[PDB]
């Protein structure tokens, strides 16, 4: 921070004595469900080496969970999001620059503890009959514990260049009626990946043996709402001061099936199985400080 | 964070030197129990791309917790509050989008613990009569917790689209009386869904034998208070500056019935069994920069 | 938040470059113990479509815990509050309405823990003759742990209308030198309900056999203040400006009796016995900014 | 908040552009160990409906926590705080009022876990005779735990009037050298009462077997520090400007004695033994703006 | 903080009444996969004894966990980054000088638990045969806890000079499904470094045994962003008022391999094994505050 | 602070409406390895009653955790900071005086438990034979438990006086691959002091056997960043207006040595082998309000 280097907080931003240029543009794609929503903010500070615009990805992606095939009582299909991505892109040609990006990757952590424990005891015995007894016995036991919180999406800043940036959310694991968490590889030989099964004996129909989505992670079913910003840089002498820019937002659904073996329900899941790709090309204008599509 | 991207905070917000025009608009539906409240404010910020109304949806729906029948001291139903929504839809041929809204969906995390210990152990024993023995053993156990937070109710923003957007805040789990929790499919071979029921072997009416309203998510009775915003966008160029949009308040009731078997209660939940809903058209003048209803 | 969407944190707030007329009404009602205040704010914001009125019901309820019944050493009773209850209410003849208030119903919330453990273990024994013995075992263990939360008393808004609008505070449950909690429910077959019991089979006289108010909530005793807002909307064309509003400050008191069964105490607790009910009427004059009494 | 309904934070909030007079009145009673100070505060703030006074009660009441009686080596008296007053009171004649105080009371809250636990383990034995034995076994357990902070001292605000307020700083309960906590109430069998009892067998005199005051709560001897606000409310047409006010600190003193048994110490606690009581009036002029004693 | 040396808080910072130039350089380096971006300011605040730049270098270093090498289908290598680094360097004939840098280096901690438990247990018992036993028993155990939080990578200020300073992300341990953390030393005798490897037994080949970057650490793949500062201080009367400085990206690689033994998989982890820098020459003119490339 | 005392906050502090001169010195002692600065204000406020400068001293002294000796492959050596410090002098016959500085000495705090348990439990039994048999315990424990953080470094204010003032961060304690903590005195009779000892019996050589420096506190190896500020007064009268202050950083190093026992390694740790000063004098002018070296 600022105060760290004995410096006035704010006295490095940029912004001030500017007019900023904001604007909002807004494009459902039906075929995909997506809300896709673009705010922008063009900052020509004049004390600042380069012309900025803040690009804010925000909207909603719908999650879509549902059951998409049923063979039967013995068999059905399942599609869910196992991930959400954002991703904006400069053509190769273009001058303008990718120059900052929020949010980006933190470091996790976790917490180790180590226990050590020594015990001694004695015993001293008897009987109605005279008979006494003894007993000394001692104890050393060595515990360790892990422990870690689990987030039911990571959000992911891809690695990005002076042209592209983009964001994953991705599936990571999931409590299932207070079992697991499961994930997309959990295997088990009697059931399969239990990931999104009801009952692991119930005699209903297939399709009807899936997990209520109301008690699953929210962002499978109502979907994800994106919130990311980008920062793009233009040299006040760059010959062409028009830009495109193209955006894509995109759902990446697996495929998770149950099927009756005989005497249980057992799953499994088939990653990547389909994707949901909705892009638009954006024009910059920075000359009149206006964003169009 | 505007910090994180170097700009100076609030540079980008919408809002600055502008006259913003607000008002409030009450109605009450006696029949379906709902105080409608809509704060709006309309912000025509000319260094904006386009006009900005935002539409606060506010007031309470009442939860109208309730034993509705009673066939006999053996039998009885109550009516709960398995969701409460509120949507705004605008007609499909209206100009005006739907542009952004808040709360959105959460990623939720869960905690996950393993412990690993071993340990050793000596014993030494003996009589009155001069025998000596001594034990020795070993041993090991692996453990995992997992630990997560679950609230009475969940809120979600359901997928929205340019056109409509709606929450639903939906009944997730409840603790009855220091045991369970206990949700819309809990199931015991004996008592059944033991939800909302006070005693198991209670020796009184049927209509009696619910747990008290105060006892229980206050949701679920006195009601839940919306606080919702959608934010809607308009070209300054639209031909029609008038805007219709349609807002909906909804209650979903569940049929929680319980019966004496012959040696204790056992409790019934029937999903969705009523539905209440509460309709209600404003017009949206964007040059007059009122709503009205 | 406003920042949430994009604008400028207060710009949508009421009450900017606008007087506003403020006041105190305190009534004290000794008969029922109660020290009601009203503190309003009216706040005419031109930009905003209607007049608005923020009353804020303060002061306090004496809780009033006292042992006021004495039948001989072996019974005795003590009144305690179960429920202080604030409500305002607009005649059915009024234009103005309620169109908010604070605080509402928060949704509750619990923690869960999962534990599963498994282990294995071994064993070799020998005796001072020759004789060597072996012992190998395995468990596994299923824990569930509920974690949650609970205050003495529960601060709930009621089912709220265009006309009338209230709280009640209800006593919940309560620790009972270090034991319980206990509620209005709490029974045990031998001392029955043991809420504010001191002693199980402490030979005093019953009246000297309740729980310290000292040792209980205060609320009992000293009182809880109430805090709450509403606030009213007034069209600035209705004919009538004046507006006649009902304020009512009431204390439901529960009866907990103690008796001598002949080896030790027993508690029973009746509901609701008694209802103290202060109410008055204000006058709103909405021309001259102006509340009375 | 004002946020949540909707208004600009300070919004109704009383003394903008108003002149405050503010003062301070110090008084040391001696003979009672007081350090009394009145900090007042008079806003006559014209668009509020009344003329206000803040008045802020401080200083010091000593604790005197100290050893009154010695009779021989085997007894021993000690006086202590088991409660510190604060009290305000208008004369009934006079038409100003108590309007508003703080603190107030507050809602407790307490912990509450419930855990149950399923276990199943086997064994299988054997020896150098070739003898072979099994063993099979289950269990379940319930367990519950109750968790809350204890203060040493509770805060109340006592039952106010519009003519009376007033707090009481209440002894609750105190860990002795990690043993309890101890109450007034507490009792064993053979030590009788060890809230401040330093040893259970020494050999010193009884006026030397108290706890070091430096280990029990620093407000037994050092004291208490009032911080209590009371607002008062005056009608600006009331004919006699002039209000006469008195205002009382208190301490109420246990008696803790000890006896030596023959054995062992034992504790004895003789409940609000003394009361200290210092009271003062003081004049409200309105029309000056000044507090006098 | 100034407010601990009773001065106002931020009186000595620096940068008021001063026009501070400031300015963005993006450069992607293809073959490294690296995003450079410095955002530069100059603060030539008279009041301060020197003229004065803060360099920030952000921008991100992919991470590029990925499979290089495959010698049949029982061996293959992965290569992973053990450490991002950025640095900036004044030639050593620069009269500027490195005054400040920020992140630091943070003290650590840990939590350390000490349990001393001792008990007595007694026991009676008794058979059809009329046989009647005893059993006294005492126990003493003494337990230590060491609890420690650990980052998967360690953010380090490196020793600086007045010319050279850097930072490096190490890597430091991570869990792996559940199990270890392990580190760059983790070693088992059968199956060695199980760092990243995905079972140990699979039949799958080498190639296809690695752990999916989905589950660890995303600054492995994804990459890492650095967000560092630093303060270059230059006198106002150096004769050359043009400074060159270096700024280098860094990310080291080890190399992770694995091998069927015949029976299970076996890692092994090469520290170091490829160094990826790259390095940017930047121009800093003093006079016309401006930084290029 | 000052809202506690009812004055507005920042009442009281210095530095409002006077114009403050602040600067950068930064030296580098190569031989010594150490970077140092100095940011220093002087604040001359007409309204306090004397001239006031505030020098922060920061930089880095690098840790230099090293392998200095190797004789023999049973043989190694290793230097260690265990202690880091910066002093400041001012001259015996100056008038400034040191009158504040910050950090300063907080009183640590520990948390301690005691638990008290105690129970009953049956066991009747039975056989094949038809021998029936019961049995009856009891049990009481008692356990305490004592908590706290250590800190691998403590940072410690030196007794100042008014001519001179200093901070010395020693080392505490540190982990050491999940064992210990480890100190300057730790001991075990077969390994001796394992503070640095990387394996208890690996067959490397002995200057391949100490910790990895990444592994341990980042102050050992890449060092520690001085944050320290001191106040000097001076009287405006005083008639020697230029005054001497005398700055001193230091490390002290331990000698870390592990040798081969012939069966496995063996530590031994030896304090203050080495100390390394670096003294730099600076001339104040309090006329010309600068400071120079």
Same mark, same amino acid.
């Given at each position: 921070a600022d105060s760290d280097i004995n410096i006035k907080t704010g006295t490095t931003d940029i912004g001030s004595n500017t007019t900023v240029k904001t604007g909002d543009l807004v494009t459902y794609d039906k075929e995909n469900g997506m809300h896709k929503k673009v705010f922008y903010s063009f900052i020509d500070d004049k004390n600042h080496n380069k012309k900025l615009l803040v690009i804010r990805t925000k909207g909603t992606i719908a999650g879509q969970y549902r059951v998409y095939s049923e063979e039967g009582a013995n068999k059905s299909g399942l599609?869910?999001? !196992?991930? *959400?991505?954002?991703?904006?892109?400069?053509?190769? %040609?273009?001058?303008?620059? $990718?120059? =900052?990006?929020? /949010?980006? %990757? !933190? $470091? =996790?952590? #976790?917490? &180790? %503890?180590?226990?050590?424990?020594? @015990? *001694? %005891?004695?015993?001293?015995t008897g009987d109605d009959t005279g008979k006494i007894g003894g007993l000394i016995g001692a104890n050393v036991s060595? @515990?360790?514990?892990? +422990? &870690?919180?689990?987030?039911? *999406?990571?959000?992911?800043?891809? !690695? /990005?260049? =002076? +042209? #592209?940036? @983009?964001? +994953?959310?991705? *599936?990571?694991?999931?409590?299932?009626?207070?079992? @697991?968490?499961? =994930?997309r590889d959990s295997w088990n030989p009697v059931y399969g990946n239990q990931l999104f099964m009801k009952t692991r004996n119930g005699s209903m129909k297939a399709a009807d043996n899936f997990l209520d989505p109301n008690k699953a992670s929210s962002l499978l079913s109502s979907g994800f709402s994106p919130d990311f910003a980008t920062v793009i840089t233009m040299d006040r002498k760059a010959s062409k001061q028009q830009t495109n820019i193209d955006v894509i937002y995109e759902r990446v659904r697996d495929d998770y099936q149950l099927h009756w073996t005989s005497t249980n329900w057992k799953g499994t899941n088939t990653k990547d199985k389909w994707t949901d790709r909705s892009s638009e090309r954006y024009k910059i204008d920075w000359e009149k400080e206006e964003m169009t599509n």
């Open positions: 599609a869910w999001p !196992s991930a *959400f991505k954002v991703q904006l892109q400069l053509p190769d %040609n273009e001058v303008a620059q $990718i120059s =900052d990006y929020y /949010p980006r %990757n !933190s $470091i =996790d952590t #976790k917490e &180790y %503890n180590s226990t050590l424990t020594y @015990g *001694f %005891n004695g015993n001293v060595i @515990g360790h514990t892990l +422990k &870690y919180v689990q987030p039911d *999406f990571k959000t992911i800043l891809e !690695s /990005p260049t =002076d +042209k #592209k940036v @983009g964001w +994953k959310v991705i *599936f990571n694991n999931m409590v299932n009626q207070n079992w @697991g968490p499961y =994930d």
